[PDB]
Amino acid sequence: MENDKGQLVELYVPRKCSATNRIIKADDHASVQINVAKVDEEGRAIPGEYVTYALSGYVRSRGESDDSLNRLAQNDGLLKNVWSYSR
């Protein structure tokens, strides 16, 4: 639901996964949020700028989270040759 006449509602929109795009629950104590820094032409992890990949407990317990992180980083440009799309 979404109201036109203002009325900010639906407090605490849940944080949403980036691996399988599914949701991350309120107390799923397995969900991780990889926070990997950005290097900008100086070999330095300049503070205050990172990129986030959210991995859920379902993916964790399935065990493909490694390949999911590789493909996410490669699509985002963070990694170069970890994961080939044509498997």
Binding site: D67, Y85, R87
Partner: protein, 81 residues
């Protein structure tokens, strides 16, 4: 394995997979353009012929069929088609 290229598989993977299990089924067979020594007797033969075919000249059987691919004679010049 959660995200995979089902659009285009690798040649090695497709060869490993069953012929009927590919994206579009294709026969694992081919034509063997085969020839017996002496007279040409040029005739293309199925790989899984299932028959002991011979040229019209004389008893010169070129295939001795087995369960799968058919065995050829001692001296046969064969080319893939």
């Amino acid at each position: 394995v959660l995200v995979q290229d089902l659009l285009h598989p690798t040649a090695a993977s497709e060869a490993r997979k069953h012929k009927l299990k590919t994206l579009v089924q294709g026969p694992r067979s081919y034509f063997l353009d085969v020839k017996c020594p002496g007279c040409l007797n040029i005739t293309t033969v199925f790989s899984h012929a299932q028959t002991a075919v011979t040229c019209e000249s004389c008893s010169t059987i070129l295939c001795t069929p087995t369960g799968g691919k058919a065995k050829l004679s001692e001296g046969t010049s064969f080319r893939r088609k």
